[PDB]
Amino acid sequence: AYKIVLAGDAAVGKSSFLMRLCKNEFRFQMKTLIVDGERTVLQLWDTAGQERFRSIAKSYFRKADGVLLLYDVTCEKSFLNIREWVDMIEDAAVPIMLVGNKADIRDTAATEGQKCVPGHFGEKLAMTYGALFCETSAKDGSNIVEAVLHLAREVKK
Amino acid sequence: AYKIVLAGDAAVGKSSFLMRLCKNEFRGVDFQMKTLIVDGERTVLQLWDTAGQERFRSIAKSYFRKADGVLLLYDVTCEKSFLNIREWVDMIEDAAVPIMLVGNKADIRDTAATEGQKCVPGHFGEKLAMTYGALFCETSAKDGSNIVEAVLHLAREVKKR
Ligand SMILES: Nc1nc2c(ncn2[C@@H]2O[C@H](COP(=O)(O)OP(=O)(O)O)[C@@H](O)[C@H]2O)c(=O)[nH]1
Ligand SMILES: Nc1nc2c(ncn2[C@@H]2O[C@H](COP(=O)(O)OP(=O)(O)O)[C@@H](O)[C@H]2O)c(=O)[nH]1
Numbered sequence: 400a401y402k403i404v405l406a407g408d409a410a411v412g413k414s415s416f417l418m419r420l421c422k423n424e425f426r427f428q429m430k431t432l433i434v435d436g437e438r439t440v441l442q443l444w445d446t447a448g449q450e451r452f453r454s455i456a457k458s459y460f461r462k463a464d465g466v467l468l469l470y471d472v473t474c475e476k477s478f479l480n481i482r483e484w485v486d487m488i489e490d491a492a493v494p495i496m497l498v499g500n501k502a503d504i505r506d507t508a509a510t511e512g513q514k515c516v517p518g519h520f521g522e523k524l525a526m527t528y529g530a531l532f533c534e535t536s537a538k539d540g541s542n543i544v545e546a547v548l549h550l551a552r553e554v555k556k
Numbered sequence: 557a558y559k560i561v562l563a564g565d566a567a568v569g570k571s572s573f574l575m576r577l578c579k580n581e582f583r584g585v586d587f588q589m590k591t592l593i594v595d596g597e598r599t600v601l602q603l604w605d606t607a608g609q610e611r612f613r614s615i616a617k618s619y620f621r622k623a624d625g626v627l628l629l630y631d632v633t634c635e636k637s638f639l640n641i642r643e644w645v646d647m648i649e650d651a652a653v654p655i656m657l658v659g660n661k662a663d664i665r666d667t668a669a670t671e672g673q674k675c676v677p678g679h680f681g682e683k684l685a686m687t688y689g690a691l692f693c694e695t696s697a698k699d700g701s702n703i704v705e706a707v708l709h710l711a712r713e714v715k716k717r
Contacts, residue, residue, distance in 0.1 A: 478584070482609050489614035520584035527585055527604050528615075529622060 400429075401554050403547070404459045405445035406484055407469035408477040412500040414447045415537035416469065420547060425538050432544075434551045441551065453487065460491035465554040467546065470516065472499045472534065473508050478516045485528055494553040495530040497521055498546055503536035557589065558714050560707075561619045562605040563644055564629035565637040569660040570605040572697035573629065577707060578603070582698050585609075592704075594711050601711065613647065620651035625714040627706065630676070632659040632694065633668045638676045638684075645688055654717065655690040656710040657681060663696040 405413040421428045421443070430441040444463075449455045460466065468484055470477040481497065488495060499521045508515045518534050525532035531549055535542040562570040571586050578588040585608075590601040609615050620626065628644055630637040641657065648655060659681045668675045678694050685692035691713060693706040 479608075482612055482615065486612040486614045489618050516584070523587040523604075524585045527587065527619065527622075529618070 400440045400442040401464040401551065402462055403441050403443050403465045403467060403550065403554075404463040405443065405447070405467045405469065406456060406459070406488075407446075407450075407498075408471075408474070408480050409447070409450045411469040411471040411474070411477050412537045413445045413469055416467070416498075416500065416535070416543060417443060417445055419537045419540055419543050423540070425540075430547070432548060432551055434548060434555065439551055439555070441547070456484075456487055457491045460488050460493070463488075463493055465494045465496070465550050466492075467496050467498055467550060468530075469498045469500045470521075471501045472516045472518075473501055473504050473513070475514060475516060478520070481524065485530075494550055495528060496546055496550040496553075497525040497528070497530045497532045499532075499534040500537060502534040502541065503538050557600040557602040558624045558711065559602045559622060560625050560627060560710065560714070561623040562603070562627045562629060563616065563619070563648075564606075564610075564658075565631075565634075565640050566607070566610050568629040568631045568634070568637050569697045570629055571607045573627070573658070573660060573695070573703065574603060574605055576697045576700055576703050580700070582700075590707075592708060592711055594708060594715060599711055599715065601707070616647055617651040620648045620653065623653055624717075625654040625656070625710050627656050627658055627710060628690070629658045629660045630681075631661045632676050632678075632681075633661055633664050633673060635674055635676060638681070641684060645690075649688075654710060654713040655688065656706055656713075657685040657688075657690045657692045658706055659692075659694040660697060662694040662701060663699050
């Protein structure tokens with residue numbers, strides 16, 4: 400099994416991402432992917448409930464084969480804090496997949512004149528880090544399985 | 557595209573350097589594509605900086621490993637930023653690459669010296685660059701002095717590897 404860690408600030412949607420991926424619903428865990436030819440099993444750890452414990456995050460990053468690092472496209476601070484998480488991963492570690500989650504609210508946010516992190520900011524930040532990038536919605540399921548497959552393919556190298 | 561990172565202490569003028577270079581103006585991650593003519597040929601640069609991330613040593617190192625070259629800035633009117641050049645060079649040499657040492661804000665040297673404030677003379681900048689085998693240049697993001705020239709000098713050394 401490949402050990403995959405979900406990290407990012409509280410309230411970015413880590414628990415929701417896992418439930419959508421594993422149980423297909425919105426309100427460690429095991430996940431079998433078919434990646435290219437092969438059956439590929441993931442063991443999925445998350446830092447939800449424990450985000451403030453740097454030592455726990457760091458320990459997870461040490462045992463990780465790969466990291467899914469979420470921010471929330473509607474929460475600017477969660478995107479600013481990506482630097483805090485990546486520094487911890489670079490020190491303790493591994494493929495990183497940067498995920499702009501909650502992409503489904505962007506239209507609502509935009510309509511009501513509220514600020515969202517544009518996707519190209521995430522693409523560019525991810526590029527500087529040598530990280531993959533993906534926008535997802537744990538709510539409507541969009542890109543959820545695809546983000547994890549893109550990470551798994553990079554881990555299998 | 558050659559990958560070029562700007563580094564150095566906060567407030568040395570990394571953003572201002574990039575904005576002057578890429579947009580010819582002075583007023584997420586700073587990230588710009590820039591085409592230069594180096595000798596005969598078109599040469600594409602992928603440029604970013606460590607503004608907002610200076611205190612993250614693991615990220616800095618990751619950036620220095622990924623760079624084809626570094627523009628490393630200090631502020632000629634701020635001695636501490638110059639002394640810290642030695643910390644930055646250690647990280648760059650530990651990580652990996654051509655370095656261009658840039659003494660930025662050269663336009664303020666007269667204002668500093670008029671007001672009794674200490675500045676780093678270019679001779680000291682050149683001497684530190686020679687210690688490390690780095691290129692050296694003084695620049696001003698504010699008035700545009702030597703900004704493109706610095707980058708071209710680095711790009712030539714990067715193409716030579
Ligand atoms: N609209 C929307 N809400 C989401 C999404 N993902 C999570 N949420 C909501 O964001 C809040 C925080 O989500 P949660 O999964 O608990 O985040 P965690 O703290 O990172 O584990 C909850 O109210 C979720 O319903 C998403 O993709 N879209
Ligand atoms: N006078 C002068 N000021 C500059 C120059 N470059 C940057 N600054 C100013 O110094 C401050 C820090 O610059 P900034 O680009 O944000 O530096 P950074 O933290 O390294 O990215 C800003 O207020 C700039 O306007 C320069 O060449 N001359």
